[PDB]
Every structure is written in structure tokens, then in C-alpha cells.
Design a protein around this ligand. Structure first.
Ligand code: HEM
Ligand code: HEM
Ligand SMILES: CCCCCCCCO[C@@H]1O[C@H](CO)[C@@H](O)[C@H](O)[C@H]1O
Ligand SMILES: CCCCCCCCO[C@@H]1O[C@H](CO)[C@@H](O)[C@H](O)[C@H]1O
Ligand SMILES: CCCCCCCCO[C@@H]1O[C@H](CO)[C@@H](O)[C@H](O)[C@H]1O
Ligand SMILES: C[C@H](C(=O)O)c1ccc(-c2ccccc2)c(F)c1
Ligand SMILES: C[C@H](C(=O)O)c1ccc(-c2ccccc2)c(F)c1
Ligand SMILES: CC(=O)N[C@@H]1[C@@H](O)[C@H](O)[C@@H](CO)O[C@H]1O
Ligand SMILES: CC(=O)N[C@@H]1[C@@H](O)[C@H](O)[C@@H](CO)O[C@H]1O
Ligand SMILES: CC(=O)N[C@@H]1[C@@H](O)[C@H](O)[C@@H](CO)O[C@H]1O
Ligand SMILES: CC(=O)N[C@@H]1[C@@H](O)[C@H](O)[C@@H](CO)O[C@H]1O
Ligand SMILES: CC(=O)N[C@@H]1[C@@H](O)[C@H](O)[C@@H](CO)O[C@H]1O
Ligand SMILES: CC(=O)N[C@@H]1[C@@H](O)[C@H](O)[C@@H](CO)O[C@H]1O
Ligand SMILES: CC(=O)N[C@@H]1[C@@H](O)[C@H](O)[C@@H](CO)O[C@H]1O
Ligand SMILES: CC(=O)N[C@@H]1[C@@H](O)[C@H](O)[C@@H](CO)O[C@H]1O
Ligand SMILES: CC(=O)N[C@@H]1[C@@H](O)[C@H](O)[C@@H](CO)O[C@H]1O
Ligand SMILES: CC(=O)N[C@@H]1[C@@H](O)[C@H](O)[C@@H](CO)O[C@H]1O
Lengths: 551, 551
């Protein structure tokens, strides 16, 4: 049997097949040596035994407000943010390594941007079991697994107070770098760009971008409805949008991300961001009357990218982490560090981000309560209520807890079923292997994974061995931190991907992070002081309750 | 008038148009301050006043063999190589900045790989003169300029002893990353990859690659002639090649770079490298009997990329530079430094690499002397003589001196004429501006540029002002270093572009530079010990005189 099926190499060592039945582990720079990269070097040992557990650190970060309030007002804040940024980032290979086609470094994997990368190589196709060596010959039925442990019975709100304003932002934001190609199959993406390029606003290709642009003042095409600004119709912006057959072009809104017409929440943000882009163009023109359409457009896009990163780190991730430490977006924090300003979306990151539990049982907008059937392909709700109204409603309605299990609404449970199926097609390694790859000890049992006994027992019977537990199911069923939105794994694995994706952007490099890049001091400050509240309120007639936290 | 036409901002400061007639310079991180970034900071001043001139350093590097021999044997070698690598590299912006369409940072310039980047923004289209502010309203006729100062009269051999083996390597090597698109126009390239990706061997696109591959043992297709291995014919490898109409497919060789069938010298290297690829596949299969075609192919490609970089730095640049310092290819030399492992080909780099003066009056192969008309599209010479014979001939024939002027054979003078024309289309800034951008003082007169009076006087009459002298003409007409192949500019401007292109390759990154990346210790050593002699001789029946230096 293939010796690499036993995942012999530890601590990022690379398993290579040699001869007919042998294997060797390349422990280069792993900090370890030995046949399996398990014998540590002195420093590797100190470091690993002095490192407190993720749970302990989480505790420190979510307690002692008074002490943190002091720390947040000093340079210690920066010192810690830089620490967070570098330690989380180093866990992500850069340049990227493997893809669905190559379980080894190759020029094709490096240059071929249509591929999602992957942190761990796949489970060799010739292993005795689907997960490698452990588990049963056949994995649990995806549907059953989903109905049994992910289906929502009673809506469980997020203890951290996360609202739908956050949920939809999450969806909107991620769908700019998660666009799995149906034509090329899993493992492939149309979101070339691999990060925060705002392609869900400008399009993932030039032609579409040009069709969305006004080519006047660097602005984006738009239309007026009830005296408000909204994305233009597909009639005025002949772009491909995924709308149900039967919906005429003049009733479709053209935005950048083909799938956004499928949710008011999504089109809401599409509208907000579009309004903001045109707004920045105005400010820019005031500063540079000699500039043409291109430069105004390009420069505005850069400002919005900056705004997006700012809001995501300081407000989105802040809300999501619940830390008392004040997260900070300051590219300069890495100017003295070794860091590659590039990023490549990993398939695991795609899986991990399927936060469908966040969606509610229904959508409350004022006195009205809308059902999934009234909400999903609604082409009028956004215009009927307008931006302010929806922002207020979404900011007030709690979102469901992500981890813990049994919390995905039946209307969208099919997505989880497909994520599990894709996982197997992608031949993703077992959850415990990913635990190790991200610095955690593997779970020794299901009862340790879940903080209980009922589900644990059933999972053990189904999977047969904790070492067979799959990636996504593991993330969603892992016991949550005290009163947190999800378990440690989601953070320990999710943070590295996110932070590398945010800071890995070229505008965060010494070369780009200059006032001139954003049209001058005025443009630079729009980035440096971006805010969710300002994003909405500087573009709406009135200012509603806007936040990622429920009131 | 546009204030940026005066190139007011110094030391890489960025000129930005403000209001109707104003401008501001963004001096961020330039080491200077002031309206024009001319007021040096304390360290900036020390460094600039303690830095000896390029000529002085050149002198040190080309004298005192005894001392250098001692140094080359110590760690000082590594120390100096690190220095050269980082100081030269820091002069190249990474991520890249501008392109033919944008004279400012933009997401499109960053993501759009079909564009060549540029170090200096173009001469604003609305400047009083073509070069900005200096010179005449009309630039000198390209043809005349070429016939007057670049046309070869009497063949001037390279004093450093460079041969045609080197000359053909240079052409072969560069055409993998210099592939200007005719359909898209100047400023656009088909060599996505922007570096040493060996696309001239494997193709610049998958389809072409696939057509060139055997899909067995990871090898490339090939054919046998006179018992020797050669690239296959277009009949077996249906791939687009630029051969003159009238030549049958059976006489066309398929290699990777469409234009290589136009010179025995080029096809020679195409054959050598192809033989080497298949050779490495053999060694790999011996090591990994379980490997499939893909991995064998991919891994062999990585090894060849490494071999190419090793040889280019330790033998190619060594010969070219004339330095007594033993250059060294070692990715680890940068592991402690801040360095972006990415590269983007600059249009200026393309211009500067037009080394046509290297070509001779005719091509001597043994007793026979071949004219340009007998050499250029010869489809039989390579097979008639075979690899060993041509390598020996090309290694023995001296190549022409690059700098100095009046040394380009009339047969190819038209290329220079076009380079000058493209320069104007690309609106490249004046030579002196590039001098500054690369750390040199601008020439105060033509007589200072050339080391003489006659041509100087005529150039002054034609251009009117030293500040109007164009990029390429400046590189070729600048007085050469003592007994060197070219002037300081060629080195001070080209070295940064070159070294960055070599070390800024993903295989030189901590993540890729591992034995596992190249199939193990055996594959790694092929890179670490690559040599021009071995490249040829481990793939030929007999071993001829092989070198970049004439005997
Ligand atoms: C109205 C509620 C939602 C619905 C109806 C919905 C529906 C879907 C559907 C149909 C798919 C593709 C399924 C397939 O191809 O089998 C999908 C993918 C996805 N969804 Fe949702 N979703 C919702 C909310 C969310 C939220 C709140 C997030 C959190 C950021 C999210 C994140 C994702 C991700 C990351 C993907 C995969 C992206 C890709 O591979 O292209 N979804 N969703
Ligand atoms: C048999 C001798 C040679 C001939 C006939 C030749 C011919 C040409 C021609 C016809 C072009 C394109 C001209 C145009 O589009 O107007 C060209 C481009 C070029 N040549 Fe040569 N060349 C020769 C030797 C060399 C050598 C020794 C080098 C040194 C590395 C070199 C470097 C280049 C470069 C860098 C380009 C531009 C690449 C691009 O933009 O695609 N050439 N040459
Ligand atoms: C003073 C420093 C002492 C360092 C000793 C560290 C002991 C690490 O011990 C290692 O543990 C691994 C996992 O159990 C084993 O696989 C290795 O073979 C073993 O050497
Ligand atoms: C109170 C000081 C807080 C400093 C923030 C540390 C940054 C978080 O660091 C994280 O710690 C985890 C647990 O050890 C590791 O598993 C992660 O890989 C690491 O990135
Ligand atoms: C005697 C030791 C020599 C070490 C080689 C130094 C590396 C070359 O360094 C170069 O020197 C030039 C001259 O000032 C500068 O103009 C270039 O910008 C710089 O990169
Ligand atoms: C700052 C903090 C950390 O590094 O611990 C952090 C950073 C990013 C995330 C995060 C995890 C998953 C998706 C999106 C964001 C997270 F949950 C926590
Ligand atoms: C090592 C040395 C240096 O940095 O001075 C060096 C490095 C690269 C070049 C070089 C210049 C133009 C084309 C190709 C190579 C060169 F001419 C000299
Ligand atoms: C390749 C190899 O030696 N792996 C072995 C595995 O075959 C065996 O079942 C196990 C028993 O603990 O130990 C390990
Ligand atoms: C000392 C050591 O760690 N060697 C182990 C070996 O005993 C085991 O059979 C193999 C597979 O897990 O991995 C390695
Ligand atoms: C893949 C891509 O976006 N490349 C674009 C190309 O389509 C466009 O024609 C050209 C001109 O701007 O710029 C580049
Ligand atoms: C030089 C080039 O290829 N640019 C193209 C342009 O010709 C075309 O009109 C446009 C629309 O797709 O895209 C870009
Ligand atoms: C099927 C459907 O979508 N209909 C609803 C409609 O009942 C509701 O009054 C309106 C409010 O925006 O949104 C739409
Ligand atoms: C914008 C500006 O002030 N530039 C001036 C230029 O107009 C003038 O011809 C020159 C005289 O030395 O000095 C500089
Ligand atoms: C102190 C200083 O450097 N100011 C100069 C200014 O006098 C000149 O007119 C302009 C254009 O060259 O550049 C700047
Ligand atoms: C532009 C490019 O090279 N992308 C390639 C695509 O053409 C190919 O179909 C796919 C499958 O390997 O991989 C990727
Ligand atoms: C998934 C995908 O797009 N892969 C394609 C493949 O289907 C095609 O046969 C080949 C030839 O160009 O290129 C690659
Ligand atoms: C026009 C032409 O290319 N003919 C020459 C031929 O005269 C010569 O004998 C042979 C040597 O390889 O190369 C070919």
C-alpha cells in the first residue's frame, strides 16, 4: 500500500514516494528532523512547549476589558496586531503549492490561476480507505449526515450578537473570491484575482467591467428609482446575470457578480458599494480636474479595495472574533517583516467559509415577516424599501450560530450536502490532519470533538474512527468556544486564510501603500478611516442603525 | 503646460497633477522630502556621499585577481553576492507599477499580465516636446539615426572574448520572456509568465505544451535523424511555427517558441534543452517508478528552470560582467531578506536587451563560412552538422561588441530602426531620466556620453539637447568601460532587471527551494551543479569546446 496514505510526515514535512514501496519525508525548514520530521530542534522545542493552547489565548483575548482598553491605546496594540498578522500568515504557503491536479509543486500549479490551491495534498487515489487508512470503506451518506447533524430544528441565534447585516456582508464579500466554475468542475474558479479585488463590483473580466462602466467621470452605470441610485438594468448594462428564466432584462439589475440578483441582501450591498464608488469619483474629480475617466475609475477602485480591507479587519473580523484587542488595519505593521504580497484562494478556505447556519428561519423587515419563498428571487424588495430600511432591518435581526451543529435552515441544507460531496471529489484529507497542519492536536475521539455524548456516539458509529471525520463536518460539529459563534478550528484554520488574503493584497505593499496611489491625502484617508456606518450613511438619505452587532 | 513634463520629482518621487495647473510629489519612502524630493535625510545623504561611482566599483571588480581569488574562497563571496542581489533588485518595483495604458498604479496594471510593465511613466502626451521639455519639436529620423551611428562598417569584436555560443544563448534565453504581441501592439506580450518559465521550450500556453509532449515518461516528443535526437516535425507536433511559406511541415521543427525555426543557433539550443529534459525524466523515473507522466514532466521542468538560472548567473552573467568576483546562484542568500518572489517584464528591459551588435558578418562553421542568406532560415544546417559541431563552431567565433556604436550588421539594422520607432510609440522618457532612475548622474553633454567629439557633435546637432537623447540610442552609444562589452548604463540598468528576473522566480522562494520540489536530492543537485559544458556534453555523442568565452 502507498506509504503516504498513512500521512507519515509531520509538521509540514513533504511525503515523497521512492522506489516501488518506499517513502521519504522532506523536513526542510520544518524545525524538525528524523524519518518523519518529529525530532525537534532546540528552538522548535522551546517554542512549542511555551506556546499556550488556542483556548487559553482565546480566554485572554475575551477577558479583562480594563487591561485591554489600556493596551489598545498604546503601541502594544500594534505589536500584537503585527504578531497576529505574521503568525497566522506564516501558516499559508506563498507562493502557493498544490491544486486539484497536482499533489506536488509544479510550474502549472504556480501559473495556472483558474485552479484553487490547497494546503494539504489530496488523499492518494490508491489508498485502502477514502480518508487514507482509517474509517470504513464507504463514507456516510452526505444527505443523511446533513439531515442528522446539520439540519436546523430550533433556530439557535449567535451568542456574540451577530446580525444579518454581517451575514449578508459575509456572503457579498466572499463571493468576490469564491466563484467555483461549473464548466470546469470543482477545484476551479472564475474569480481569478484570488482575493479582495472587488470583482463582485467591477466584474471578473474586462468586457463585463466595461459594460458596467459609464466611461464618464470614472463612474459605474446606474439608474434612478424613487429618486434613489441603484445598479443599472441589464438592458443598459448588457451583462450576464443569473436570474430565473422569465425575468426580462429591464427588470434585472447588473452588478458585477452574476449571482447577486438572487437575494435582496446581496443587491443591497451591491447598491451601497456602487453608490460609494461614484461618490469617491466625485471627490477625486474635485481634486483632479485634469484626470480622465480611466484614472478616476481605477483610482476609485483602489480606494474601495482599501476601504473594504479596513472595514473587514477592524469591524467584520472584530465582531466575528469577539476579541478585546482592537484589531488594526495598518499595512506598515509588516514593512519590517518578510511577507509575500500575493494570495491564492485555497479549496479548504472555500469549504470552511460555507456559513449557511447564519441565515434565519425568515426575514423580518419592520412589521413584515418574509419567508424564503418571498425573499429569495425578489426583484422588488430592495427598491420597495430602499437601502436605509433594509440596512436597519438586517442590522436588527440576529443571525444563527455557525458552529455547534443542527442549525442550518432546511431551505438551504442542500448546499451543505453538496459541500460534503465536493469534499470527497476533491479528496480532502481528514479533519484531524488539518488540525495538525494548523497547529492543533488531533481529536482523540468524537466526544472530545463535540463537547457531548449523543451526537458523538452516532458520529463514531457512522465514521468508525475520529481520524475519518471529514473537514467541513468537523468544522461545523466541533464544540464552540464558551459563548462564541463557532469552535476553535474555524478560527485557527480560518484566520490564516483570511489575514493572508487581506494583507496579501498588493495595495498593502510598500510600493503601493502611498497617498499617490489613492489620488492623494484625501483618497488615502478614505481608506484609513473607512467605516461600515460611513459606507452606508454617506450614501443614504437618512442614517439608520447600521452595525454587524445586533442592538 | 503640464508641470509633470519637467520631471520635477526626483529620487523616485511620484508626480501627481493637482487642480488645473499644479502638481505635487509623493516622496513617501524615497529617503528625501521637499517639494521635489530633493532634501535628503541624514542616512540617505551618507549613503549617497559614501557610495563610490559605478566606474570605481567596476574597476575594483575587474582588477586584483589574487585578492578576489582569496575572497571568492571565503564567506565574503556570499556576503557580496547578497549585496549585489539586494541592491540591484531594490531598484525594480514589486509589485509592478505602470504599463502602456496607465501611468499610475491601478488594479488593471497589477492583474493584467498581457501588459509589459514600465519603470518610468511615459512622457505625458501633452508635453511641448516629444521628450517632455527639451529637444526639438521633431525627433531625428530613426533610419538615419541608425545608419549614422549604429550601422556596422568594420566588425568590432567583443574585447571580453564573448563568442556566438553566448550570443545565441542570450537570444534563445530572452525570447522566453520577450514575446511582443503583434496583434495587440507594442507594450503587450504573449510571454505571460514574465520570466524564466522555460516557455520557449514548453510553449506559452497549455494547448501548445500538450501538443509538444509525448505524454509518456514525462518526455517531450522528438524524432531521430542520423541517429541523433532532434525536436519533432510540425507534422507530429501540430504546433504553430513561423516558417516562410513554401517550406513543407516535414522540414519544420516544433519547439515551443514559434520563431526559433529562423536560426540554427536557436534550434541548436532548442535541441540541447529538449535532450536535457528527456534525460532528466529518465533519471527521475529511476528514482520514482510509481510516478506518472504528469509529475515526471512537471518535475523535470522545474529542474530545467533551476538549471537555467544556475547557468545564467554563474556562467552567462559572469562572462558578460567580466567580474573577478565569483557570482553565485543560491536562493538561500535571500532567505533573511525582504524580497518579493514575483517578476514582471518591463518594456525598457525589452529595449535594452536588443543586443543585435553581437551577430557577426558571417557564420564560420569549420572551413565553411556561411553568409546571412545561407544561415537565416536554414532548415538543414543543424541536422547536417549536428549539435557538437555547431556548439564548437559557435564557441570559437567571437561575437561583436555591444556598446560603442557603429557595430550592427546591415542585415539586421532594421530591428534597431524599429526599436527606436517603438520607443517613441511607447513614449519612453529620455535617457538621462533613466540614468537618474537607476542611480546615475545625468550626462551633461554628448561628448561626456560618447568618449569622443565627432559623433557627439553630430548627435548634439540632431537632438539639440543631451536631455532629449532617447533610451536605446543612449545605451548603445554610451562609451564602453575600458575593455568591456558595453557601457555602465547597460550594467546599471540591466543588472537590476536581470537579477530580479532570476531570483524573483517562485523556485527561489523558501517554499519551493526544497529537494522534494525537484524529485529529491538527485534532482536538486542537477540544479545546484548545472553547467553549460554538462548541459551540452551530457547530451551529445562527443564533447566539443563549449563555452561563452572564445578560446
Ligand atoms: C439566502 C441564504 C443563502 C442561500 C440560498 C445560499 C445558496 C447557495 C448556493 C445555491 C450555493 C451553490 C451550491 C452548489 O453549487 O451546490 C452557495 C454557495 C456558497 N455559499 Fe451560500 N447561500 C446563502 C447564504 C450564504 C452565506 C450567509 C454565506 C457566508 C459567507 C454563504 C457562503 C457560500 C459559499 C462560500 C459558497 C461556495 C462558493 C463557490 O464555490 O462558488 N452562503 N450558496
Ligand atoms: C540572426 C541574428 C538576429 C536576427 C535576424 C534578429 C532578428 C530580429 C527581428 C526580426 C526581431 C523583431 C523585429 C520587429 O518586430 O521589428 C527581433 C527582435 C528581438 N531580438 Fe533579434 N535578431 C537577431 C539576434 C538577436 C540577438 C543575438 C539578441 C540578443 C538577446 C536579440 C534580441 C532581440 C530582442 C530582445 C528582440 C525583441 C523581442 C520582442 O519584442 O518580441 N536578437 N530580432
Ligand atoms: C531539552 C530538549 C529536549 C527535547 C526532547 C523532545 C522530545 C521529542 O521526542 C520526540 O517525540 C515524537 C512524538 O512523540 C517522536 O515521534 C520522536 O521520535 C521523539 O524523538
Ligand atoms: C495576549 C496576546 C495575544 C497575542 C496574539 C497571538 C496571536 C495568535 O496566534 C495563534 O495562536 C494559536 C495558539 O497557540 C496558534 O495555534 C496559531 O497558529 C497562532 O497563529
Ligand atoms: C567592491 C565590492 C563591490 C560589491 C558590488 C556592489 C554591488 C553593485 O551595486 C551597485 O553599485 C552602483 C554604483 O554606485 C549603483 O549605482 C547601483 O544602484 C548598485 O546596485
Ligand atoms: C484576529 C483573529 C485571529 O487571528 O485570531 C482572527 C482573524 C480572522 C478570523 C476569520 C476566520 C474565518 C473567516 C473569517 C475570519 C478569525 F476568526 C479570527
Ligand atoms: C552581477 C552584476 C552586477 O550586478 O553588477 C551584473 C548582473 C546582471 C547583468 C546584466 C545586464 C544586462 C543584461 C543581462 C545581465 C550585468 F551586466 C552585471
Ligand atoms: C508503513 C508503516 O510502517 N506503517 C505502519 C502500519 O503499516 C502499521 O499498521 C502501524 C501499526 O501501529 O504502524 C505504522
Ligand atoms: C520513529 C518513527 O517515527 N518512525 C515511524 C514508523 O515507525 C511508522 O511505521 C511510520 C508510519 O506511521 O512512520 C514513521
Ligand atoms: C485577460 C485580460 O483582461 N487582458 C486584457 C485584454 O483582454 C484587453 O484587450 C487589453 C487591453 O486593455 O488589456 C489586457
Ligand atoms: C488591444 C486590445 O486587445 N484591447 C481590447 C479592445 O480592442 C476591445 O474593444 C475591448 C472590448 O472587449 O477589450 C480590450
Ligand atoms: C413573491 C414576492 O416576492 N412578493 C413580495 C411581496 O409580497 C411584498 O409585498 C414585497 C415587499 O418588498 O416584496 C415582494
Ligand atoms: C513649473 C516650473 O516652475 N518650472 C520652471 C520652468 O517653467 C522654467 O522654464 C525653468 C527655468 O530654469 O525653471 C523651472
Ligand atoms: C526648491 C525646488 O527644488 N523647487 C523646484 C522649482 O524651483 C522648479 O521651478 C520646479 C520645476 O523644475 O521644480 C521644483
Ligand atoms: C489559461 C490556462 O492555462 N488555464 C488552464 C486551462 O486552459 C485548462 O483547461 C485547465 C485544465 O488543466 O487548467 C488551467
Ligand atoms: C477542465 C479543462 O478545461 N481542461 C482542458 C481539457 O478539457 C482539454 O481537452 C485540454 C486541451 O486544450 O485543455 C485542458
Ligand atoms: C541556402 C542554404 O541554406 N543552403 C546551405 C547549403 O549550401 C550548405 O551546404 C548547408 C550546410 O549545412 O546548409 C544549407
Amino acid at each position: 500500500v502507498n506509504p503516504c496514505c498513512y500521512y507519515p510526515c509531520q509538521h509540514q514535512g513533504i511525503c515523497v514516494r521512492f522506489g516501488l514501496d518506499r517513502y521519504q519525508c522532506d523536513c526542510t525548514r520544518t524545525g524538525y528532523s528524523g524519518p518523519n520530521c518529529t525530532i525537534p530542534e532546540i528552538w522548535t522545542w522551546l517554542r512549542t512547549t511555551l506556546r499556550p493552547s488556542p483556548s487559553f489565548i482565546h480566554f485572554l483575548l475575551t477577558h479583562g476589558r480594563w487591561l485591554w482598553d489600556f493596551v489598545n491605546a498604546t503601541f502594544i496594540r500594534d505589536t500584537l496586531m503585527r504578531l497576529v498578522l505574521t503568525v497566522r500568515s506564516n501558516l499559508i504557503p506563498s507562493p502557493p503549492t498544490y491544486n486539484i491536479a497536482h499533489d506536488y509543486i509544479s510550474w502549472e500549479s504556480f501559473s495556472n490561476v483558474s485552479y484553487y490551491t490547497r494546503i494539504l495534498p489530496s488523499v492518494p487515489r490508491d489508498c485502502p480507505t477514502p480518508m487514507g487508512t482509517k474509517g470504513k470503506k464507504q463514507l456516510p451518506d452526505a444527505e443523511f449526515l446533513s439531515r442528522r447533524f446539520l439540519l436546523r430544528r430550533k433556530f439557535i441565534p449567535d451568542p456574540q450578537g451577530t446580525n444579518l447585516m454581517f451575514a449578508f456582508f459575509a456572503q457579498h464579500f466572499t463571493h468576490q473570491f469564491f466563484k467555483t466554475s461549473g464548466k470546469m468542475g470543482p477545484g476551479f474558479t472564475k474569480a481569478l484575482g484570488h482575493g479582495v479585488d472587488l470583482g463582485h463590483i467591477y466584474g471578473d473580466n474586462l468586457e463585463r467591467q466595461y459594460q458596467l462602466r459609464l466611461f464618464k467621470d470614472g463612474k459605474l452605470k446606474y439608474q434612478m428609482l424613487n429618486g434613489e441610485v441603484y445598479p443599472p438594468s441589464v438592458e443598459e448594462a448588457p451583462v450576464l446575470m443569473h436570474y430565473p428564466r422569465g425575468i426580462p432584462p429591464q427588470s434585472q439589475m447588473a452588478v458585477g457578480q452574476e449571482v447577486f440578483g438572487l437575494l435582496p441582501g446581496l443587491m443591497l450591498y451591491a447598491t451601497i458599494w456602487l453608490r460609494e464608488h461614484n461618490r469617491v469619483c466625485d471627490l477625486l474629480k474635485a481634486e483632479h480636474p485634469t484626470w480622465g475617466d480611466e484614472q478616476l475609475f481605477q483610482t476609485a477602485r483602489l480606494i474601495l479595495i482599501g476601504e473594504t480591507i479596513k472595514i473587514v479587519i477592524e469591524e467584520y473580523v472584530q465582531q466575528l472574533s469577539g476579541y478585546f484587542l482592537q484589531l488594526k488595519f495598518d499595512p506598515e505593521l509588516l514593512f519590517g517583516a518578510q511577507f509575500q504580497y500575493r494570495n491564492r484562494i485555497a479549496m479548504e478556505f472555500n469549504q470552511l467559509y460555507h456559513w449557511h447556519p447564519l441565515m434565519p428561519d425568515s426575514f423580518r423587515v419592520g412589521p413584515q415577516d418574509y419567508s424564503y419563498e418571498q425573499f429569495l428571487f425578489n426583484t422588488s424588495m430592495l427598491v420597495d424599501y430602499g437601502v436605509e430600511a433594509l440596512v436597519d432591518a438586517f442590522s436588527r435581526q440576529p443571525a444563527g450560530r455557525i458552529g455547534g451543529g443542527r442549525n442550518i435552515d432546511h431551505h438551504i441544507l442542500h448546499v451543505a450536502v453538496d459541500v460534503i460531496k465536493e469534499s470527497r471529489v476533491l479528496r480532502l484529507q481528514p479533519f484531524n490532519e488539518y488540525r495538525k497542519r494548523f497547529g492543533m492536536k488531533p481529536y482523540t475521539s468524537f466526544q472530545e470533538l463535540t463537547g457531548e455524548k449523543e451526537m458523538a456516539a452516532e458520529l463514531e458509529e457512522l465514521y468508525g474512527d475520529i481520524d475519518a471525520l471529514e473537514f467541513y463536518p468537523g468544522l461545523l460539529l466541533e464544540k464552540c468556544h464558551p459563548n462564541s459563534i463557532f469552535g476553535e478550528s474555524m478560527i485557527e484554520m480560518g484566520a490564516p486564510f483570511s489575514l493572508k488574503g487581506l494583507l496579501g493584497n498588493p495595495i498593502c505593499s510598500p510600493e503601493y501603500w502611498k497617498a499617490s496611489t489613492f489620488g492623494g491625502e484625501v483618497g488615502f484617508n478614505l481608506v484609513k478611516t473607512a467605516t461600515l456606518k460611513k459606507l452606508v450613511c454617506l450614501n443614504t438619505k437618512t442614517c439608520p442603525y447600521v452595525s454587524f452587532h445586533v442592538p
